[PDB]
Symmetry: C3
Subunit: 226 residues, 3 copies
């Protein structure tokens, strides 16, 4: 099967490792063997003017996903929200309460459905393609998340005297002359990876290391040789 998925991830961190704002929203097309993506879109946010409790991320995710989906016509869209695979077009207050989720999760999504449910309904009317909230269960979602990490590092390289990027969960990045590679650190996932072309700037040093306050998350730090 052919799947379009999206995720928002990558954060600017302050010096005590507290998130300031998110960076990259990515939509990816994933096909067999479901390890990477060769066709994807990115939209950068402004992390210094970001509402971390604003939940603009998922609105960005579905729009980018639909934009990619219109170009490549997948079998399904995977949205990063763990609701058990329920179709977003079937999302009303009735079906939300029946979900096996937290009370906070139910109230976040009753408010979100007001824009997203009509969006998904119209896209389905147009194409027959469902938008499903599968979240943690989805491999395409994890691949989008890996790419959000890569594009965040690409963003950091392009916008740096010092920057701390908090990567999405247990992934690493590698810097090469003409590209950035991102890989899951979890071998249980079966070797998920991504790769993006970019020019790596001069006069900067970088390091990748564990976030001391959030175990299994890495930090990518850029410093100027100044």
């Amino acid at each position: 099967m052919r799947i379009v998925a999206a995720d928002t991830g990558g954060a600017v961190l302050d010096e005590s490792f507290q998130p300031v704002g998110l960076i990259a929203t990515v939509a990816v097309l994933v096909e067999k063997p479901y390890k990477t993506s060769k066709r994807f879109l990115v939209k950068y946010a402004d992390p210094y003017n970001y509402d971390l409790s604003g939940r603009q991320a998922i609105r960005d995710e579905i729009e980018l996903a639909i934009e990619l989906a219109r170009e490549v016509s997948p079998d399904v869209i995977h949205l990063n929200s763990t609701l058990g695979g329920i179709e977003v077009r079937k999302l009303d207050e009735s079906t939300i309460d029946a979900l096996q989720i937290s009370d906070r999760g139910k109230e976040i999504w009753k408010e979100l459905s007001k824009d997203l449910q009509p969006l998904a309904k119209k896209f389905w009317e147009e194409t027959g393609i469902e938008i499903i909230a599968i979240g943690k269960s989805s491999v395409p979602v994890r691949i989008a998340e890996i790419y959000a990490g890569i594009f965040s590092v690409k963003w950091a390289l392009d916008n740096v005297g010092g920057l701390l990027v908090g990567l999405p969960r247990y992934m690493e990045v590698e810097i090469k002359k003409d590209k950035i590679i991102g890989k899951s650190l979890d071998p249980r996932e079966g070797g998920l990876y991504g790769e993006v072309k970019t020019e790596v700037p001069q006069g900067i040093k970088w390091e990748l290391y564990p976030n001391p306050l959030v175990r299994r998350f890495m930090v990518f730090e850029i410093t100027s040789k100044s």
Copy 2:
């Protein structure tokens, strides 16, 4: 310590990666250093006539484990159900209510005890060996699960014009000229593996890749 454990696993999947039915029930003997098994039994189900919500799996498991136990006389039997290590022979509705599990889990075992508890009682009487529901905690149970995976692939090799097999959680298989090797993909488990001798047919291609719908589960695909 010498342990017999059992598990059912491996599923035939349709073209949209949905499970059709389970394949292999395996009982293993596990001994020090507790990384693999050299002595085991397999039972094949019919995945095309299987009730996934039917729980013949756990019934198959205890029977097979008992069959193996009678032959190799272990210290204990491990059953793949996470109930905190309570003896199956001591499982009645009284002790079931006290178990710290979901009510769905409670209603499942109220039904199961009716058959299994007398069996465990009878088996304990004969041998002194306990049958304990330990599940996720047991390394022998995970080694059986890995073997279930290997045997599912063997099943795939024996019945292939094209098949998709969903393996148990995060394990890989490698096919060599005369055998199938299965390994946990989780280095935290400390290097669990299994190996089965089988004849590999000619004229086939196979591939192993992530189930796109079930993260950390792999798919084994084989074509003629």
Copy 3:
């Protein structure tokens, strides 16, 4: 950031892999890149006269961390307890009930607070350093745990006709000629490790293998050649 963390870990096991008692309490200093510690303290317990239930451990940990902290003046102390990051000086009957932890945990810490809360208060008054119950989230706590493992093996080597050591969760140890190395087995953690100097006695053999009754925990076993 500079962090002091502490943990109690390592157990003597009987022949059927049941824990008899714990071995090592360690405080560690962790600095960038937050993968290991080069400065640490250990206190060994008597595993054969130990009350597993319990809580002499946390008392030892906070004492040991304060002792290390006085020497190295960290930014914060992490105690191995997952309470959401609440300062131990702020632990009273009111705030303990507000914690999203089990009813068992709440009644336990109302008892612990009577000794620990004044201790953290006095230390904060003196230095401005908070002692926080962060637990599972802290990389420094995980590094302390690894060191607890290493020191537990050192203890076994120094006190061994046969010993079984149950290590902390998913870590391995390597014996070298003049030292013991400990490593996390989880690559998602980003390569956490430790190293402790010791003399390896003669006339003994060792093996590392899975604890069959506790999945993802390893056993370090020592046997005499006599």
